[PDB]
Amino acid sequence: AYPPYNLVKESNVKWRIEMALAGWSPDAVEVSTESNVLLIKSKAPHQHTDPDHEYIHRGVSTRTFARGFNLSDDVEIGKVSFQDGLLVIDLQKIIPDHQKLKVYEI
Amino acid sequence: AYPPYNLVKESNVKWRIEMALAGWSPDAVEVSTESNVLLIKSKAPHQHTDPDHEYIHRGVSTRTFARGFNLSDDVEIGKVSFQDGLLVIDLQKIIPDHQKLKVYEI
Amino acid sequence: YPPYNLVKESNVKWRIEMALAGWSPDAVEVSTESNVLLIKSKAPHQHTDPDHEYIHRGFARGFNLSDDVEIGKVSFQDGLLVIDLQKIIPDH
Amino acid sequence: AYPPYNLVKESNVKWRIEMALAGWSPDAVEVSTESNVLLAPHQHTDPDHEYIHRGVSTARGFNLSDDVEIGKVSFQDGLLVIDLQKIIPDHQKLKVYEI
Amino acid sequence: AYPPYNLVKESNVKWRIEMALAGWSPDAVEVSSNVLLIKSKAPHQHTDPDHEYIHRGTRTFARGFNLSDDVEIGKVSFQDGLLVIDLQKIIPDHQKLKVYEI
Amino acid sequence: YPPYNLVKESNVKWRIEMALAGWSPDAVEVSTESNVLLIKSKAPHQHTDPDHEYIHRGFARGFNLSDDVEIGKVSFQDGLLVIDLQKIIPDH
Amino acid sequence: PPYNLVKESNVKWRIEMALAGWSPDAVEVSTESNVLLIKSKAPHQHTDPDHEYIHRGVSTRTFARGFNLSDDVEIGKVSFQDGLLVIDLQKIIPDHQ
Amino acid sequence: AYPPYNLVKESNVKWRIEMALAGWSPDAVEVSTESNVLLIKSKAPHQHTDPDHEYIHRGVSTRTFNLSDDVEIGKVSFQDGLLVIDLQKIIPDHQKLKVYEI
Amino acid sequence: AYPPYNLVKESNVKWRIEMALAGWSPDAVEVSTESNVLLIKSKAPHQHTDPDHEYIHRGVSTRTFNLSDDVEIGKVSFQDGLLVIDLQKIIPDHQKLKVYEI
Amino acid sequence: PPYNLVKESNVKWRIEMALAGWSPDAVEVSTESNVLLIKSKAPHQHTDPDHEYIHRGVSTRTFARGFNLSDDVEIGKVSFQDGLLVIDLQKIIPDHQ
Amino acid sequence: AYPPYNLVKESNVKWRIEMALAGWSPDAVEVSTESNVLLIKSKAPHQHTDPDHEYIHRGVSTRTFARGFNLSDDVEIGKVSFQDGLLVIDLQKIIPDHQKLKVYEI
Amino acid sequence: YPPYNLVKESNVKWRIEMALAGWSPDAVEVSTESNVLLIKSKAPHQHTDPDHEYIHRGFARGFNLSDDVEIGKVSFQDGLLVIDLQKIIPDH
Amino acid sequence: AYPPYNLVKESNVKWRIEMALAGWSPDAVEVSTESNVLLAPHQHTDPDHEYIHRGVSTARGFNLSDDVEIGKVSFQDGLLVIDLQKIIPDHQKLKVYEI
Amino acid sequence: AYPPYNLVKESNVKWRIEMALAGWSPDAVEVSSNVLLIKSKAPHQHTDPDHEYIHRGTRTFARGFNLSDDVEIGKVSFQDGLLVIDLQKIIPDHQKLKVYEI
Amino acid sequence: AYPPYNLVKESNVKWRIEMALAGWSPDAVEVSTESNVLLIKSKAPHQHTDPDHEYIHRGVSTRTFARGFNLSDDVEIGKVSFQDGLLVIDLQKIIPDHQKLKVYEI
Amino acid sequence: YPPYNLVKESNVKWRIEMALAGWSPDAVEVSTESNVLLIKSKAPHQHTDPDHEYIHRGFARGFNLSDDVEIGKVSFQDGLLVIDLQKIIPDH
Amino acid sequence: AYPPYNLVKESNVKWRIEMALAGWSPDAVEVSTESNVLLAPHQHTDPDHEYIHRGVSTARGFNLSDDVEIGKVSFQDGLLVIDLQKIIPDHQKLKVYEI
Amino acid sequence: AYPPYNLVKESNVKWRIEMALAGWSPDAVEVSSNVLLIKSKAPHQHTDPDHEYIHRGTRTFARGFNLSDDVEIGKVSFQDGLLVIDLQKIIPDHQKLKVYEI
Amino acid sequence: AYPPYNLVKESNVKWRIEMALAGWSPDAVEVSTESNVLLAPHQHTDPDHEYIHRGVSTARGFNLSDDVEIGKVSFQDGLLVIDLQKIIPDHQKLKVYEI
Amino acid sequence: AYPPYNLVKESNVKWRIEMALAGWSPDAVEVSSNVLLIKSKAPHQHTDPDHEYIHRGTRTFARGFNLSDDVEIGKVSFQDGLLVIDLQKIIPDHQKLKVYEI
């Protein structure tokens, strides 16, 4: 029921999002960033009807959806690459300055 | 059982609250703001009794209620408009300065 | 259905109080049909808020009159309908 | 298996009965008004070979509200559409007052 | 509720269909690879309400039946809200009603 | 299995639209066998992301053709397969 | 009713049948469109006084029995004897035997 | 389930029996009268040894399956797999069917 | 459960009874004929008093357990724990096994 | 079939057995690898006309009965009388009695 | 099973805690404040035994318990009043400087 | 009901210990009736905190005495009632 | 208890039947092609003492797709491997066009 | 699905085993403290797909049976996909088929 | 199913972690600190197979696991002591400057 | 019970590997009894951490030996017990 | 169906029995004190026509605590109110000591 | 627990009601569109406790019965805690107790 | 209802049977060693009046591990305490090596 | 598991108790308002382990029985792990074993 999303966890600073949008034109698609909370909003602005001129079973269903995720501040965007009905968005932020992993006592 | 409330989500900065208070006088009603946590408190200060002089079925029930919601800081108020037993409260705050939604790579 | 309260002031008087919130004066048209009152509430606007922004949220009525009704007052105040009806004289 | 009946008020003076009767001719059907209540002359030996299975097969009362009368009955496209007319309640008055 | 329907079985060459369509005009209704389709499609009819008209005991319907080849149509008669369609085809050279000995 | 939509343009034409996301041109090889179309999707890479970093996440098809098919157009655009087939002439 | 089946050969199907009491005018057989229909229709009935008649086990009824044949099945002989129907059919020539 | 037999009750004295034995030769069948008790024995002398592959269905098949004094037998007519046995006996010297009053 | 007895049915007149009494001495067993009703009584005179520890299983054990006129007895042969009782009586003057027609 | 058991002493096990009708050629006993097998195999059968025979209670059947003995059990006597088998075994010498 | 605690909500700045400790000496009782997270720890340091010299049913049971609550910073203490086996602790903090509750438009 | 503990010091002595938290000296009045002790706890204030602010939160007793009782000490300390009773001499 | 059968298409012109028949010799087994459908001569009185329990014990049809033919049958290691060959559908053409 | 297997019981000295291994080559198969192990271990065989070959009705198996000491092997015969292993050992000095009196 | 971990709660400033890693070489083990969120990642880099030369039942199972815990900032490390297949990690941070536990009124 | 793994190096050798975490050298004492090995693990300290601070958290074994055992090596390394046993020569 | 009884202690010397007896006259009712335990003279043939359904229809013991006595019995408004008086336990003493 | 009540059915003109009100004073009780209402309303009575008085086996009640028009009241009698109300009205000109032939 | 038995190994050479036998004298009880397995002489007519209900009422085998022997049997306080002694397994050797 | 116990009922004056205490020394055991208490309280005994000694089929117990007044004790005998306590009191002046007429 959830459209088929995937989240790819690169480094300490970088998290990529992988997206299955097949048939979606770029005029339909709209992303939004409100207070470091990402809203991706697919909206069919042409609103293709469900006519029965001679149309059969439609298993794949698509019109208008909305999603939200509170990100840890202060997320920026790196790249977005539209390639064969998939979106690979690259978000790149986090500066803790404490990634040390070496201590021993025997 | 919850009195019939509605929350209306305007912009990135603005969130409106819609309120069904029918029969409530303004002396009864009391709102409260403690540490950016909104408490709306309807209190019947006249305390209308349930007499049986000749009174029948009372499906609509009303005396004293209390509600709470932790808002993200630093919420202020814009307008409140009492019009035919409804309250439309306009809250207007949020300054992220990162609402950019355009990046591509092919 | 909206939520209805009923009261007798006396045997003369029935008083109905009604929570209709958001309803406007053109949206409500009442009718009297066959010794039966019909309070109809019809939205004269296709209530469509912009789906993009707002989505997520949480009629006709008939009642027989017991000859012979005399309608008093009907007040549209603070989202309430307060109707005052009158009927007795049973001669007995 | 009774036919399917649909009843409606046009207004205060307009009942309307619409009725699906398929295959019914003009001498089989008979209506009667009895006590303020509205209410196959030759049948056939069906041949088994030709009549393997019919998927269709071919009295109904409704006590009237004082005091119903008739307007127009009309056979069209296998339906039955009966107009009935009655009112006088001496009460069709709408009243409202106050801000 | 799909409507209800009778099938008469005259000969081996002829199969007649009896369809129950009451209130249907003859521009709504449309008949059409050795497969028959009887489609009823409201072109110009009334939309219902909940105020004046309410309770009932009629929209658009389509039907399919894969017949053996190569069926033609004969005569369609619209009377008493009934469609009586005649279909006439088949010569299998095998309709032999026989065989008896002692 | 991927999710399949089916449409008749006319009786002539069947049009199939297909969501294959991430699939590449070498990964898809189609075949025609015994008046039956087989659309096979085989990963030509052992899809192994570095387990260390990425783990947690959320075929062949056969359909009989009704003599005699004429394949039109097949477009690999924006993660969709849009195939246009043709078959009628029943002489009747 | 109770039926039994035999393949003499690839050529031959034989159907054996128990019809007890059935008269020769009642029985009919049709070979319509490569589909056999063995009909058994009593023409009329017998005067049955429910007074002294008891627990009637034999439900006397008409029946039509259809079977879609493998193109294209033919009849050979039918012999009515000992209250049995022995029907001989004949078809093959599949060039695969 | 057993074979479907019918008993006709002609008179007080006479009882007729209708047996359904289809495809039974007359040397398999035998009837016995012992101690004023009848026994109708269907006894296959040898079962027709046949293959179970060519004969797809063998649901219905053929295998092997006290009166008031002083019973005699009238007739037994075997034709077209139906047995009709006529029995005629009973004398109580009391078969008067009369008496009526007000 | 009771002892496993078998009744052989020789003729209408003659009936034979086969009783299974293993390990039963002949003074325990007794047979009685009373009012044209037989009674075969197995009666242990004293039970062999034995210990229940050394004898692990005592599942199967030994304890204590209307004809048509005018029955007589023919023979009763006791050997290797099997009783074979020959009874021979029945005369209805009606044992004819004949009658056949077309 | 119905079996009974006895320990006369530490030396002695005795098995008492009801075999009714069994003939002397049918019965066999084997002492194989410190495991006793008392066999009861009817050599052939009897002509059984199902006509007048009724409710056969005695299911006549062949049976082989094995029991793993405590090393190392021996036979003493077997006496066939009154349709009983009385088998005497003898072993002890455990230096613990 | 929870010992019988009560929380009393005075003002926007003040929240009182009411406590049922009957028989508890003050040497036993120990409170703790770690990063504005209150830990009250009752510990029977005498560890009264359960002897059976002639002792009957003991429905009231008491030895060692521990509790925790993350408070909003930077909680301080006001008073604590030991009076008849009850503790009334007064915590007093919160400075939002936004408690305004009056806006209208008609 | 409040929670009650029971102890014998000896056969002479019963000692009852009682958790009554918030209870005051006027709120508790004890009675002796028919060789039966009745410890009654009655609120002499209608305990009504201001609903506006505070709402959400989480009797009589009779026991027969086994002739002849001698009441010792009863201490109201730190929300406890510690009563010391005395009864033996069975002459045997 | 029938034996276990496995059917496979090598290609468009290659069916392949593989068959487990253990203990089966070369005169017991008989195959037949009947109506476009592919389909123990002396048994033994097993001695009870030696044959306490066997844990193995020793007709099957499949209507063919017009119009199957035979290639090579081979007994090896107690299996049966039958090659069958047939095609001509007049249709083995792959077609695709567009960006 | 473990494969299926017969055990023949010649004498008290000899016990023959019959194993069902069809399609197994004689380098895969391997036989080996008075406990027999018949291991079948695929050394060089085909791996399956889901495209050309699909449905079936054969991997690696191992078996253990604690025999009384001190078993040796006699002859193993690989024919018709059957292994017939002969094992020949045992002299218990107790195979006495006797004892009868009156 | 969770490998057998234990958490030891020293002071207000110090929390120790106790770890059951038996058979794990130090080349396999890898810890990670991303934005004060500890990820301990055991990865068998030799990838010991499950051969059947003569190997029996293996109840103890070990290959690759990963764990995560969001710590309150700004966690540092104190000691780590590898001693008989156990790891005792000492984390030491928290400066509230409000640990006072003494107030009375009678 | 602690979790036990079992391996044959050959028929000669059994090798047992054992997760005993926190266990010390005085806490483990092994015994051989009646051709049966008993690995006993007894805490020589009453493991009592200060309840005040730490509370919340998440034996003997016998196995018969198959004459005649020869114990090889037993290594207490990194919280593992790796025992190497030896037994074959069946003369057959 | 017994009547409904309510028992009460006024004090240590005051039991009080209150009793609903509707339609009961002054010669039907009889009370008795037996063994330290407190415990329709002419009935009618009701006529079916007039007496379609009555929705009402018209011995009880309680062992007394040594040693109960009587005070005042009073018929008023169809009830029965019996005052009983007894005490002397030689023990009505309240005692308490300590801070 | 609603109280319990008897209805006596004198004539077709007269219907008498018998109400069970024990302990009720005559200022509490009140009787009143061709619909009778018998209301019992505590005006001056005692409120209960849980200390002195406890267990029981009496508050305020109201009753409605739509009678055919145009009922009047006759006499109400308060005795033995029973209310006996007399109502007397009805002339339907149809109380004919007849009709018999042969 | 058998008595209650408790078995224990003191060491490798020390079994110990402890046994509750209440009311049992010294001539009723008999023990026997049979085939490497360890295993009321005059009863009374109890009088019903005096013996209303007794709340107590008054052979057991255990195959021994080659080859058990006896030490000391002792009646004390209604119990039975049997010491048994046996070992020689030719194997009581503990061995361990490595860091 | 509470231990098990017999009660003997000599006369109306005398009731003897038989207690089952095996392994109990006479300093552990202690007997004591016309209510008898037989308390068994381990003073000096062994604590169990799980290594040497394990399975069983004995701690501290107390018992109470409200006897009619004013019971005294007679004799307590500790033999075969049984306590046989004698209690002797009661004169009700009513033990009359009589009353018969015709």
Numbering used by the authors:
A (entry chain A), B (entry chain A), K (entry chain A), O (entry chain A): 44 to 149
C (entry chain B), F (entry chain B), L (entry chain B), P (entry chain B): 45 to 102, 108 to 141
D (entry chain D), M (entry chain D), Q (entry chain D), S (entry chain D): 44 to 82, 87 to 105, 109 to 149
E (entry chain C), N (entry chain C), R (entry chain C), T (entry chain C): 44 to 75, 78 to 102, 105 to 149
G (entry chain F), J (entry chain F): 46 to 142
H (entry chain E), I (entry chain E): 44 to 108, 113 to 149
The authors write:
Small heat shock proteins (sHSPs) prevent the aggregation of cellular proteins during heat and other types of stress. Each subunit of the dimeric building block of sHSPs contains a conserved α-crystalline domain (ACD) flanked by a variable N-terminal arm and a short C-terminal extension. sHSPs from the cyanophage S-ShM2 (HspSP-ShM2) and its bacterial host Synechococcus sp. WH7803 were characterized by Bourrelle-Langlois et al.. The crystallographic and EM studies show that SM2 is capable of forming various types of oligomers, which vary in size and symmetry.
